Design a protein around this ligand. Structure first.
Ligand SMILES: CC(C)[C@H](NC(=O)COCCNC(=O)OC(C)(C)C)C(=O)N[C@@H](CC(=O)O)Cc1ccc(NC(=O)[C@H](Cc2ccccc2Cl)NC(=O)C(F)(F)c2ccccc2)cc1
Lengths: 104, 102
């Protein structure tokens, strides 16, 4: 009912540091979600390592909370299946890291 | 030049105020570009250089820093062609996390 064309070839941004994930008070890991019926097909989702957050001393402090920061994202989904380059839009949620948080 | 078709009827999916309770809270700044789809984009900005205490005072021995993501956005191509588009990859701060320096 409303349809458009898109060139998936790309240009822009170099990178670096980005071990925020390891020095955060609310650190995380990245889990690969691969779906071949989907553009992009590889997506990296963040997952908080602890319930609590990390001390100065480097011990977990459960009076606080690692929680994930999320984003609504649009992704491409094959429509109909078996059709290698026709697609519909699909909105989804993506954890991109965790932040630490006071519970009240 | 690999090219594909997209139906913009978007089904399906699928308050939480972490921005205010984070040790490394932040605000959102509007970026608007009319030659861009989406045109309005909200970018996060850490409120403090340091992070917030239990006591609720700023502790500069630590660091609010933004968490970013690579994002794709659409740009008409050729310009003034209302259906055909090219991809453009962008960085987006979506919130801040607190961090131990070196
Ligand atoms: C992202 C929207 C879901 C959101 N809008 C809504 O909830 C409803 O959208 C109704 C208007 N947007 C719209 O039609 O999107 C297009 C005009 C596109 C068609 C919105 O506009 N948010 C914005 C305002 C704000 O809220 O601060 C912030 C925003 C901006 C762009 C993006 N970009 C995307 O989600 C794109 C979708 C896309 C865009 C352009 C070209 C190709 C593709 Cl596949 N996908 C990706 O970046 C990704 F798939 F690569 C991806 C995957 C995994 C992790 C990270 C990224 C995300 C969020």
């Amino acid at each position: 009912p409303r349809t458009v064309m898109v060139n998936l070839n790309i240009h822009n941004r170099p990178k670096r540091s980005s071990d925020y994930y390891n020095r955060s008070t609310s650190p995380w890991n990245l889990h690969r979600n691969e779906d071949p019926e989907r553009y992009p097909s590889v997506i990296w989702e963040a997952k908080c390592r602890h319930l609590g957050c990390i001390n100065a001393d480097g011990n977990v402090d459960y009076h606080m909370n690692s929680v994930p920061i999320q984003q609504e994202i649009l992704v491409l989904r094959r429509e109909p299946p078996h059709c290698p380059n026709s697609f519909r839009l699909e909105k989804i949620l993506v954890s991109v890291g965790c932040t630490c948080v006071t519970p009240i």
